[PDB]
């Protein structure tokens, strides 16, 4: 009754203190520091490969760490592993549930995880002693669809869900070591820091949170957007990240100063971002949109410079290689281009 | 370079064997129709599954493989996981036409399914599911549809209506008022790319999977006629 309103008044005053601590450390905006640097140019990438074997819309892809093999998931229940140099498909893994909303590729290359509307995160063993691709585990503790999954070892995948819960698992025994709570709505994508000591998570409540992986506790919360956050990615030096929401705007948050630095919005783009990823230098910010075409944002001036094209439907997945060579973008027309 | 040529050879020999099976899967996957079946908690979709986070129910009428799947595992918010279903033939939307207190909730859900960027090309098969409970409730008289819908006092049974022989002129007016509510939400925005096919169903209808066959056949025939610049 009265204690709830009292604690809510204290929480409001404390949020005002947080806001005043964030507006005091606002010396000058990133656009003012970057007014003296040269523009990026006009990045004109061309489709160096078109990978076509999927029956239905491609919902997620992930690059191997060798920057050559990639895995892609489509809603026909197929998880195909391509050789992006020769455009041969190494494996074609027939899933159990068609509705696969994500996939990952073990940072060593041994295992592959997927998992969608069946609330579990299946994990597949690629290099088996018999040569067959079988299911290694099925992590089945989530209550709601599974909207991302990022390997952290050969044993320690972390997983986002459609029940506001990220859950760090333990693939050996098969049960979640930690559970990260604090989001209000569906949590849509996560992105491990390059050292994997912490990660960020974007949710359908217009907010992102920074999770310590060891302590299992929300470190910081970033809320500057206006609608669902569909895509998130870390800056290559792990000290910043970019959210892409459905209010048709990408933003660059920084974990240190704890604010928003850039806003990647224009007055003609009224379609929402479905994917983001940086370039190996952290200057180009790829961003897949609903108007069926990616962009390439100069991520220090906010000026567009470059536009990708050539997809029939919305661009769902988008990921730069680990060495910075290519940029593979899948889309709901079941074709996976590769740019350069 | 013999080892490298053997690498490329045994890689092509595997891509060929994979694309063979994948063409087989393409043949199978296209002779099968997917049908997102969604309703409400009390609607009665569980009883139209007449066979985890999804209850797939395969059935086959007239040698065509239908593949219907209720989605129960997820929580109440459905704005993100429903985009997964923009490639289904139909969307079977089942509603109980008896509980008037929760009929505007179904009207709003239908209006949000209809006017959605990704479901804007999917046609809905509308099942009005508890016709016998509706007959009972409206023949009793304690429940008045004009308390929840003030424009039921100025409604007149359609002329093209087909009142089943043996029923009251009150049950028919009640049925068709709700059917016309959904149909007017339909036609107010649907520009020929998707349609709504309303039906009246009980819980004992044994000919309820033929009515999905006849409506999917029509959905797809209109799709073909419309892509041949022929409608």
């Amino acid at each position, epitope marked *: 009754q009265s204690e709830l309103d009292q604690l809510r008044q204290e929480a409001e005053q404390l949020k005002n203190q947080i806001r005043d601590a964030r507006k005091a450390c606002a010396d000058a905006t990133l656009s003012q520091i970057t007014n003296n640097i040269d523009p990026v140019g006009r990045i004109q990438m061309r489709t160096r490969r078109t990978l076509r074997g999927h029956l239905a819309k491609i919902y997620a892809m992930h690059w191997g760490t060798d920057s050559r093999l990639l895995v892609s998931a489509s809603q026909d229940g197929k998880l195909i592993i391509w050789d992006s140099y020769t455009t041969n498909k190494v494996h074609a893994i027939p899933l159990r549930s068609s509705w696969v909303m994500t996939c990952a590729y073990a940072p060593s290359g041994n295992y592959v995880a997927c998992g969608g509307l069946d609330n579990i995160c299946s994990i597949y063993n690629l290099k088996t002693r018999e040569g067959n691709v079988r299911v290694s585990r099925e992590l089945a503790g989530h209550t709601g669809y599974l909207s991302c999954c990022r390997f952290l070892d050969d044993n320690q995948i972390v997983t986002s869900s459609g029940d506001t819960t990220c859950a760090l698992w333990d693939i050996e025994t098969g049960q979640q070591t930690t559970t990260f709570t604090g989001h*209000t*709505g569906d949590v849509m994508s996560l992105s491990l820091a390059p050292d994997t000591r912490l990660f960020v998570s974007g949710a*359908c*409540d*217009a*907010s992102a949170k920074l999770w310590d992986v060891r302590e299992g506790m929300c470190r910081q919360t970033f*809320t*500057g957007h*206006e*609608s*669902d956050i569909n895509a998130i990615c870390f800056f290559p030096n792990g000290n910043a990240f970019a959210t892409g929401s*459905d*209010d*048709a705007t990408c933003r660059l948050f920084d974990l240190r100063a704890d604010q928003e630095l850039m806003t990647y919005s224009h007055d003609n783009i*009224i379609c*929402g971002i479905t994917s983001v990823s940086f370039s190996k230098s952290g200057r180009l910010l790829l961003a897949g949109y609903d108007d069926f075409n990616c962009n390439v944002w100069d991520a220090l001036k906010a000026d567009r410079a470059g536009v990708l094209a050539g997809h029939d439907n919305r661009v769902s997945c988008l990921g730069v290689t680990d060495d910075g060579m290519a940029v593979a973008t899948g889309s709901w027309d079941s074709f996976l281009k590769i740019w350069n | 370079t013999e080892d490298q040529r053997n690498e490329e050879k045994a890689q092509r020999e595997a891509n060929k064997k994979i694309e063979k099976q994948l063409q087989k899967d393409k043949q199978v996957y296209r002779a099968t129709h997917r049908l997102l079946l969604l309703g409400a908690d009390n609607s009665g979709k569980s009883t139209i599954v007449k066979q985890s986070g999804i209850f797939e129910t395969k059935f086959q009428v007239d040698k065509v493989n239908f593949h219907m799947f209720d989605v129960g595992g997820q929580r*109440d*918010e*459905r*704005r993100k996981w*429903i985009q997964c279903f923009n490639d289904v033939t139909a969307i079977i939307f089942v509603v109980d036409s008896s509980d008037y207190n929760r009929l*505007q*909730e179904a009207l*709003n859900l239908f*209006k*949000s*399914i*209809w*006017n*959605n*960027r990704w479901l804007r090309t999917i046609s809905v098969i509308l099942f009005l599911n508890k016709q016998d409970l509706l007959a009972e409730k409206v023949l009793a008289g304690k429940s008045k549809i004009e*308390d*929840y*819908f*003030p424009e039921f006092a100025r409604y007149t049974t359609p002329e093209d209506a087909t009142p089943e022989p043996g029923e009251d002129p009150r049950v028919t007016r009640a049925k068709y008022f709700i059917r016309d509510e959904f149909l007017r939400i339909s036609t107010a*925005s649907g520009d020929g790319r998707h349609y709504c096919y309303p039906h009246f169903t009980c819980a004992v209808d044994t000919e309820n999977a033929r009515r999905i066959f006849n409506d999917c056949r029509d959905i797809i025939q209109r799709m073909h006629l419309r892509q041949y610049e022929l409608l």
Partner: nanobody
Amino acid sequence: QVQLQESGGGLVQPGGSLRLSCAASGFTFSNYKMNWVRQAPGKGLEWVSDISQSGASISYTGSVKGRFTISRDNAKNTLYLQMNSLKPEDTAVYYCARCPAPFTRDCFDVTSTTYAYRGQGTQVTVSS
């Protein structure tokens, strides 16, 4: 941060009038189709009345038709609901929802039990 704080009224007699105001802030008001949902004591969430981006396509729930008048003021980032001829069936808390995405005609999952873009609510108790 997206916030929508309502400021309505308290106790009225059956047949009374009351005007709920919902100062929306933290986001561009003009791009979203606002709403009004209510929760009657001992019941679930139900939708009362919406309004499009401009104030052109109004809609109502049956029970609220003729009595309530939803009107937005895009200049001051606020949403109004005028209530006339209040009945005891209208006792509830009135949340001022808004819609998930902008520039959309579908307002999806707006009466969900835990929904993100929605006010704390104001209690409109009509009695004697």
